[PDB]
Structure 1
């Protein structure tokens, strides 16, 4: 089982690094070599025993960040520096020497308040805001930098020639006052990260783990080397920009958390993101690696998938099944059995002979299709893709110069070198409608197995000593191989349209920056209740590090879920960003209408709730795209001073407005919902019952229950006319749900555009509306005047929670006479429904309750 994968003791560089224990560091800074440059401070470091000379490059950056880079002064060969992950060269701030002694130099970033104290012996860095110590570097003396010398290592039957010998780097960080750290996905583990003292470090190495288990630090399919630290008082982030195999130790100790990163090769390159709030950290990290790509609206709908739908007739029966059972669905997925023997970009000539016709039928239902395209290419001289890549030398190579060959789904297969920009350009051009024969504008793509998975490779992946573009070793680039696949596919979908259509690409492997290219999911989970539960902490850990478009297979990939579990997973999935049902080849069919009526009805209700909330989902993703704020959020992000939220992972927020506690236990009769916030009220969106915070509420549940609460002070837009797909709905009127604060106020936003193009950016064709309630007046105004949109969308209804009965309701909009609205009021629930305002969503207007 797990003997297939290295523990830290079996990873020779991790064993060496981790044997260095906290103590007096042998490194010291040579203050005579210190130079203050235009962008950076450089100073030489030296190992006291080996006399090896390193160069520290220290930079203050705009937006309250610090960058630390350490490399060899005179290396025999260049070390790897991670490309294509940073979206720009980060703007710097000026450093000044503002203090110095014989063993210390104090530096000021710009004109304050941030300062960096460089200690010479032993080498050390302290980061301060005024006189408050924020963070220390190498305080435990764990810095380790194996220089390149003038080795051979075997695991199971695979031998790493390791021609450059030991080159691993490592460094420790101390976080005074921090007891809670988060991030570094992907692990099937709790949201709040555990100390690693008595066990394994957390491992970051994109790996394909068959039937992975829960509550363990084994590396899974993706790696985002970003750690967030939260306390009552401050938020910090650490971004370790290294693409090699990386291990992370976490230890606690007046409260303080120490973090240690250990990577196989490359330079030391770390960003310190100083907050002070968690939203400052979100902004800081987004300025470095970018923001969530704005998904086309259809991709926020429901996806129906399995391994595998049999043929074109099966796909069309599934499509018709949704309409015959009145369930919405936007996309049906085609797994690997749709191709000719797992030759990607092809179609099985018997079961998919007319793909354009199938796609046309789906388009007539205003639905899409997703086809899988993996990055392993069958070694087959009749396969044009293989022949082109072979002839143009675009494959990953071995040390003897031959193309690397491993084993995957089509048998023997080679692996394109996606680190090569010429290879990525070839890949993108292959998605043209002339090259990818049988594709059409409503066909989108799923990249799987892009760790890369190699069935006969060490740890089921590529050999460390395979050779990539520019002579870099596979051990140097491993964790960005999948990102490059994701990136090139997404660019292919953009290019095939002439640069107009937004892409949709789901990817299994990922790295920092993958949020720019589409969605991810947590791989091959299992149809069990604890796998349902763990989807929240896994997608929350991804949300915190910028990957907002996350989900888990609804129903579980492996095994057959009992119907009650499948209902609960639909309810859970309906309130998570990427919403796809998927299943293993040997499972029973579980399209949602194959269940008994009581289970069908609960699932249909969950699908209707999701489709009604699409305007809300779309606006949260627009805010993620513009600001870098996560869509799905831990409670502690919204309540940073409520220490009882710091570990919660059976509950989450969507934006700031909705709190979700899905039922995740068989036979449950109720749930305990923690409603946070001093002076805060929460509305049960099914009963409209208002609840004051903070409290733990016992809420009885039935099979149809999805515990959802809207926060007082928020306005949530909904499409109350659920149709068969999102395309059918995107011209429909909006219903506004206004949840009044105790002060009688509320606010919200709404983003609208054509739903699938870049016209919002290239032509400013979009709407961003601000809705605000205060006193007794609801006002719609523009939150961005640059955006204009031709749209028939109008406001058909306003639902106000927590309001008394007015005497009259008066609407004013520019260009129209003052109008009277009829209304309905429930004295028991204090719910006020305003009938048919009838005003365009593009117009300024106000409604007054008299």
Structure 2
């Protein structure tokens, strides 16, 4: 039974919450922090200066260097460090060798670009109470630094949007020695969960208040079982009483509707209102808490006699490290997320297969079990791409081995899968069994690659294998070593279709405090674990990612790695899932806001365990879960060890038939999924998109988190996630025409509204927005790889403008040849009775030399076009005219007139145009 720190039980949380209580209750609180104005210089997109913190009654100060950077992107950055610790002028307790510097390598792990300073940024005004810097797009952005008390207002369009230290909560815990007097009860040793943190540095937390002025909704800081629009944390009806926490942890049977930490953390928050968006990224790898309150701008936020405009107050604090924050001024959600991704990276180009359906449990028990499931899925016409092996495949929980009794012929298993282009995923976790006759542990120890305790001994604790050590993936030599262990001729029983799942990388330690490592463990660089905890999981996923790039000579190819724990930047390395969820309706419902929050925080490749991990879902629940799951970018069924087998062919009729139809829908849309992942790769566009993102002008959209748009398609989904619901109310965001994907019934035209839609068990509620084109593949196949050369259908969805656009991206799904132009990317435009296809980027034909994959694609066609909302002037016309590659011909079209609420639509068959070429098709 699992104990979790509440705020009051975390020392530095208590002190920052108490600092906040004092400041908001004190009369004319002033933050005891001031810029020494004569220390301050501006040059070349950068202010630097010394803040002086007054630390006592006698007016004694310490020096904290400030750097405000103004980047070419129009993003700003604010860093505050501690001069005394930069210089090494402190003493650690216990003769600790822990680093004295404030942790400063989060940047190195996370930030991959966007750091160029804007030499167009300039001082506009400065007296010696303040200075205003103009920066960004034609100098539209301003930051007003106030010197005494320190504060910054970030403005655009003549208003303040974000304020730092307006409430005076800035708090940098300066180093002090442990002395008795001539409340410090949390400053030093702290005990929790059977462990005592020796706390060699003492207090060193960093915190700040960040106000979002005139914003009522904030979003982000996944992962939490919480709504997408984040809740208040200081009490009130339907609010939380604790701050949101980010401390990656193994949270068994995590509850719904809670600010408690889960497995991964991305400290990126956005605020949105009608036609305005801003955001911040709090670049800190330590335990981090965020309090949120909303109210009027007065000190009593319920006061009368003041303006009613709401400001959202947030209060961030982390255990150690630099105070280090980026500020994004938007002004759209797209802008903000795009800038974040430039900083932290876009989604990696995925293995195409990994967008298929993944089949998993704890555990498939033999190579005969695997092979029998593969054959059963084919028997029941349930397509899938990957079958997954959990920890029981190992030899007594040693990674890089197999249980030879149960997994006789792993290579044969692999090859049976290879006959349908299917794949195998095996689990590898970061704990390495402490035992005899095990080369992997010997090398870990002998090469000094393990995480260490507070005195430099090798750390030891308990997980699956019993007594274990943990790889320190912060250490580049540990990463380089790990690479070597995955070569096909080193890791026996694996081969070219074997990929990897990392879990327990929080890290999970069964006998540790809060099921993780002590805070005073030491990592490569001599950083304390407290400094880097939230990066740990990402270091390990990174190690594994780079290991799969090349596993034999000649090979260079896209990794696929699933992780449990993560940080800002993990999008570069693979997928995540939301951990050990539960087989209950509430968890199915919660999955959607969680997965949305992932993508709007720049890590869209995300999902939850279909069916729920713990327990046994009813058959209707499981069926609904498939209908939701087909819209997770990462779509996997998984089940705990005590749960019954529930491979989907075991459900029974009519559930089997409905689940198979969900699967077929996912597979038919794979062309559009893959394209959505392409855009996530190009600029960090989310793969599924909430209403606030797609419709920033529609205020009613802000709190909506149960429906979403898919990629670029205009498809709007609202899965049923309530027991015995047989209809669904979909919020229609705007005035465009929306059609039922299945019947083409007109759900709305002309007016934003809530529309009621029939939704029995066999129905997936899915609408097609007018103005869009999207591609699918109609021919059903057993896996994604067997679709690779099938023809495409294009769906052209027209509203009253009779105009549409969309796109389609393809490549080999596996190599890095996309980096040299080996891909097809089409833009489809419908206008003035004409559908055209052009290169999305406007490349000329051969300036690119065709490789082997592009040549094969010459046999692949668009064969079918469906126009929904077909105009009446096409009635009685029985051909269209097709032009492509110099040739012109006629193709048959059937016009079907409107009928009841069913739209007019038209179908062109046997179009016969190669997907890689320009074309023009004239209707009417």
TM, length-normalised to structure 2 = 0.90
SS state at 2:418 partner = helix
Aligned to 2:879: 809
Corresponding residue for residue 782 of structure 1: 839
The one-character-per-residue Cα deviations of 1:169-202 (angstroms, maximum 9, x if unpaired) are: 1011111111000000111111110011121000
Which residue does 1:585 correspond to in 2? 641
Question: For 2:224, which of 168, 184, 187 is the aligned residue?
Answer: 187
1:472 aligns with 2:549: no
**1:138 equivalent in structure 2:** 165
Displaced runs of 4+ in structure 1, greater than 4 A? 785-788
**2:200 aligned with 1:163:** yes
Q: Which residue of 1 aligns with 2:733?
A: 676
- 1:378, 1:386 within 8 Å by CA — same for their partners in 2? yes
Of 488, 495, 508 in structure 1, the residue corresponding to residue 543 of structure 2 is: 488
Native 8 Å contact 2:114 2:342 kept in 1: no
Q: Does residue 32 in structure 1 map to residue 59 in structure 2?
A: no
Aligned residues: 847
1:534 has 2:544 as partner: no
Structure 2 partner of 1:288? 343
Q: Distance in 2 between matches of 1:740 and 1:400?
A: 68
Aligned 8 A contact 1:300 1:579 in 2: yes
Match of 2:276 among 234, 258, 278: 234
Note the C-alpha offset of 1:78. Answer: 1.2
Q: Would you say 1:172 and 2:209 are equivalent positions? A: yes
Residue in 2 aligned with 1:714?
Answer: 772
C-alpha contact 2:885 2:917 (8 A) present in aligned 1:
no
Q: More displaced, 360-369 or 98-107?
A: 98-107
Are 2:507 and 2:516, in contact at CA under 8 Å, matched by a contact in 1? yes
> Which residue is equivalent to 2:156?
129
SS at match of 2:370: helix
Partner SS state of residue 633, structure 2: coil
CA distance in 1, matches of 2:560, 2:77: 33
* CA RMSD after TM alignment: 1.3
Displacement of 1:160 in angstroms is: 0.3
Q: Does structure 1 retain, via aligned residues, the 8 Å contact 2:194–2:512?
A: no
Contact 1:536 1:652 in 2 (8 A): no
User: Deviation of residue 101 (structure 1)?
Assistant: 2.4
Does 1:848 find its partner at 2:888?
no
**Aligned equivalents of 1:428, 1:274: Cα separation in 2:** 41
The answer for the alignment partner of 1:564 in structure 2 is 620
492 and 355 in structure 1: CA distance in 2 versus 1, 3 angstrom threshold:
same
How far off its partner does 1:130 sit? Answer: 5.3
Cα displacement (A) at 1:401: 2.2
Cα distance 1:282–1:337, how it changes in 2: closer, same or farther (>3 A)? same
- Equivalent residue runs for 1:474-553 within 5 Å: 474-496=529-551, 498=554, 500-553=556-609
What's the offset of the Cα at 1:134?
1.9
Q: Aligned residue for 2:112?
A: 87
Deviations 1:593-646 (A, max 9, x none): 112220000000000000000000000000110011001111121111212111
Choose from 265, 271, 288 the match for 1:246: 288
* Separation of aligned partners in 2, 1:207 and 1:707: 35
Tell me by how many angstroms 1:89 deviates.
6.2
Alignment correspondent of 1:837: 911
- Structure 1 gap ranges (5+): none
Alignment match of 1:338 (pick from 383, 393, 396): 393
Find the counterpart in structure 2 of residue 107 from structure 1. Answer: 133
Whole-angstrom distance in 1 between the partners of 2:917 and 2:114: 41
Q: Residue 796 of structure 1 aligns with which residue?
A: 863
Q: What's the offset of the Cα at 1:399?
A: 2.4
Matched residue of 1:495: which SS?
Answer: coil
Higher alpha-carbon deviation: 632-641 or 91-100: 91-100
Query: Does the CA-based 8 Å contact 2:880-2:893 persist in structure 1?
Result: no
Give yes or no for the alignment of 1:737 onto 2:795.
Answer: yes
Contact 2:878 2:894 in 1 (8 A): no
Contact between 1:735 and 1:796, CA under 8 Å: does it hold in 2?
yes
Contact 1:809–1:848, Cα closer than 8 Å, also in 2:
no
* SS of residue in 2 equivalent to 1:371: strand
Match of residue 9 from structure 2: 10
1:622, 1:273 → 2: CA distance?
Answer: 24
1:310 to 352, 355, 365: 365
Q: Which residue of 2 aligns with 1:264?
A: 319
The TM-score, its normalising length taken from structure 1, stands at 0.98
Query: Alignment partner of 1:261: what SS?
Result: strand
Q: How does 1:751-766 map to 2 (within 5 A)?
A: 751-761=809-819, 763-766=820-823
Shift of 1:400: 2.6
Pairwise CA distance, 1:766: 0.2
Shift of 1:822: 1.0
Within 2, Cα distance between the matches of 1:74 and 1:495? 45
User: What corresponds to 1:20 in structure 2?
Assistant: 19
Q: Which residue in the other structure is 2:233 paired with? A: 196
Matched, 1:432 2:487: yes
Q: How does 1:447-466 map to 2 (within 5 A)?
A: 447-466=502-521
Displacement, 1:811?
Answer: 3.1
Tell me, yes or no, if the aligned pair for 1:672 and 1:697 is still in contact at 8 Å. Answer: yes
Q: Classify the secondary structure of the residue corresponding to 2:388.
A: strand
Structure 1 distance, partners of 2:430, 2:885, is 57
Matched, 1:255 2:314: no
Say if 2:763 is the partner of 1:705.
yes
In structure 2, the gaps of 5 or more residues are 90-99, 178-187, 236-240, 296-308
Superimposed CA distance per residue, residues 439-459 of structure 1 (whole angstroms, 9 cap, x where no aligned partner): 101000000010000000000
* 2:124 equivalent among 98, 102, 109: 98
Cα deviation per residue 1:742-799 (whole Å; 9 max; x = unaligned)?
A: 10011110001111111111x3110110111111111111112446622022011001
3-state SS, counterpart of residue 666 of structure 1: coil
